Amino acid sequence: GSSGSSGAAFAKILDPAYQVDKGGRVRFVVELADPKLEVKWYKNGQEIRPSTKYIFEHKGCQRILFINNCQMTDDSEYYVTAGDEKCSTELFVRSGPSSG
């Protein structure tokens, strides 16, 4: 049983940490071993709803998510669930200049 469908739902988990510009837009992509399973996005223990701000894109066995208006305050924890597995990541949105 080198590698099989025993204890694995997410083919590719989200990065350990993301980085985007203020009032910008982040990119969250995730792969699923099988389309049969369902994907769910959550932000700080709160189900996210599909809206202009949240862009839900479904392609075969991939689920992308875009969040517009990325503000320092928006920076929150995100975790997606699929089947009998789930992962989590941290968003790091900058704000303001650095040098000059």
UniProtKB/Swiss-Prot annotation:
Residues 8-94 form the Ig-like C2-type domain. It comes from the Eukaryota. Thick filament-associated protein located in the crossbridge region of vertebrate striated muscle a bands. Slow skeletal protein that binds to both myosin and actin. In vitro, binds to native thin filaments and modifies the activity of actin-activated myosin ATPase. May modulate muscle contraction or may play a more structural role. It is linked to Arthrogryposis, distal, 1B: A form of distal arthrogryposis, a disease characterized by congenital joint contractures that mainly involve two or more distal parts of the limbs, in the absence of a primary neurological or muscle disease. Distal arthrogryposis type 1 is characterized largely by camptodactyly and clubfoot. Hypoplasia and/or absence of some interphalangeal creases is common. The shoulders and hips are less frequently affected. Belongs to the immunoglobulin superfamily. MyBP family. Interacts with USP25 (isoform USP25m only); the interaction prevents proteasomal degradation of MYBPC1. This is Myosin-binding protein C, slow-type. It comes from Homo sapiens. The chain holds residues 252 to 338 of 1141 of the full protein.
